[PDB]
Symmetry: D2
Subunit: 143 residues, 4 copies
């Protein structure tokens, strides 16, 4: 299948325990290419807009409060079947249900503080990436 | 003695061979904290301005050529005695003369393609960091 | 009917002759709102990844050459029927065929150096804006 | 003495009443050059850091409230004795006391909502500019 893109956010729990290099290597080892990256401190509004999807959900407030508790790292990953592949090595959203070797298994403390977020689909990825990055900022690799 | 900052650039050789995660983890393992990060592709001018110090030096233009051949990753590392510490684990500029365990030993192919650059002092760090980052972009860790 | 958005680029001819304030006020007087703005020096690469649409056109080379000859200003304009309105006060692409009172009439020297560019439809606007700006950077205002 | 730089912030009062074009043209007419610009929505944290100088002053709280109430425009102006020239055009901080023709006279409603901020010295300018802009983002004019 064709090369796709997905968004990776390293959440503040993983940033603050200094496991950024560790997490990014996992993606690279799986054959994904990091084609954009920037560390940013999300404002309240910025977080609300990204998770606008879940605005009417129950725990939107806690999610937002956690995602703005410190700096995150926002990333675009490129490669063959990138969406499903990112998802695989990240593992189940719930860390206690995650497989051995996944990022959720190895770095996540709880449901809330689950280390990293990833795009769940083809369509979700396009929106999530466009939200954080202008198209010119994405530097797909040439050599 | 105090916490300092230094600039790390992962050069295009290391970006294109997908060793970014690997290199960042080395920094983190040594107890440095990544407090800013962004992937950019340097334009001709960007590069010239950063290495303005060596403009007068003869090869300069091969360095410029190399640094703009593809995307790089620019980061700010924070921690105790951060300058000397970054330099330690980076290793000698010349990769053949670097020790075992350093980034130059493990990732660098030649003098020219030597994987990464780092600030070489207290004062050069301030200038190099200010060149790539506004002070508000630097996100000191609170959690 | 509905409030829309369009992209404004003040090209390097107009930037270098210091007419930025003049042009922006024209937009504002017409009831459009500037909801994003940044001055950038477009790289040779950036070059019309923007103008990818005219990549096969003959004189593409000169357009790109001109658009990177100096700094431009990239803007998002918001308001009722913003697309047609921007186009109205901008005027015809040829400055000599442009109507009196328009930007092309008042600031443009030639076909090549025609002061400013604008989005030509709803669909082209969405693409052009997304190219230069992440959605979070666009600040619709309240107060 | 040579060309200098100063920071201009168009505050949210002036942004929301759509006088950005008007204010910028004033600067340009005076022979100052806009060499950087970006519209931003300052978070609490961003604003507090910029006015860190007045953090022990009593009124601080209201200043911060106002500066984050909506989007602002941050600008770097370059030209001969740019610092005193920016200050001339702007007028007295207190709009009552401002001369005719100045920005404070023509756009400012009160002490709090005084339309725009500027750097007050060489030294304050260097820090204010560095705070919002990396040195590479500043595009001094060619051509």
């Amino acid at each position: 299948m064709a090369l796709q893109r997905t968004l990776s956010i390293i959440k503040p729990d993983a940033v603050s325990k200094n496991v950024i290099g560790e997490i990014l290597t996992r993606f690279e080892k799986a054959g994904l290419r990091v084609v954009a990256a920037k560390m940013v401190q999300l404002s309240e509004r910025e977080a609300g807009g990204f998770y606008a999807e879940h605005k009417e959900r129950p725990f939107f407030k806690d999610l937002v409060s956690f995602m703005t508790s410190g700096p995150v790292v926002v990333q675009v990953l490129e490669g063959e079947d990138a969406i499903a592949k990112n998802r695989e090595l990240m593992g189940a959203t719930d860390p206690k249900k995650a497989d051995a070797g996944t990022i959720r298994a190895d770095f996540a403390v709880s449901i809330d503080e689950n280390a990293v977020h990833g795009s769940d689909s083809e369509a979700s990825a396009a929106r999530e990436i466009a939200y954080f990055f202008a198209a010119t900022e994405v530097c797909e690799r040439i050599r």
